[PDB]
Amino acid sequence: FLERNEVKRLLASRNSKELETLICLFPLSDKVSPSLICQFLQEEIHINEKDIRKILLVSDFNGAIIIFRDSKFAAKMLMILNGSQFQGKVIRSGTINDMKRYYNNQQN
């Protein structure tokens, strides 16, 4: 598709207005892959075309880039939703850099 183009452009995006109205969800375990992500997103986050400006699956550091409707909720939800327990692991989130950190934690 055309997700990878934006996952890359978003990875590098310098606009912090973006990283505020968006974050990379990191609850994707070794038992939870890209498709399952979205299901689970609409499943728990109630994500749709309304609350989500756009959603892309980030499977090279198991994350999910999500822009809810506003910066206040993206970070606020990050804090209230994450730090949870799912699939026998603790699920957490951050943005593009924090996901890269978590990635290290994943690959190592």
Would you mind describing this structure in some detail?
The PDB classes it as splicing, rna binding protein. Keywords: RRM, U6 snRNP. The assembly is monomeric. The protein is α+β, with helices and mostly antiparallel strands. The protein has helices at 3-12, 34-45, 71-81, 96-107; strands at 23-26, 54-58, 63-67, 84-86, 89-94. A hairpin with a 4-residue loop joins strand 2 and strand 3.
What's the short story on this structure?
Helices cover 42% and strands 21% of the residues. By secondary structure, the protein is an alpha+beta fold. The chain has one domain: 2-Layer Sandwich (Alpha-Beta Plaits).
Number of domains: 1
CATH fold type:
Alpha-Beta Plaits
Q: Report the β-strand fraction as a percent range.
A: 15-25%
Task: Provide the succession of SSEs.
Answer: HEHEEHEEH
Q: Radius of gyration from the CA trace?
A: 13 Å
PDB class: splicing, rna binding protein
Keywords: RRM, U6 snRNP, Splicing, RNA binding protein
Assembly: monomeric
Entry title: Solution Structure of the C-terminal domain of Prp24
What key attributes describe this structure?
monomer; alpha+beta; Alpha-Beta Plaits; 4 helices; 5 strands; 42% helix; 21% strand
List the helices and strands and how they pair.
Blueprint: H1 3-12, E1 23-26, H2 34-45, E2 54-58, E3 63-67, H3 71-81, E4 84-86, E5 89-94, H4 96-107
Antiparallel strand pairs: 1-3, 1-5, 2-3, 4-5
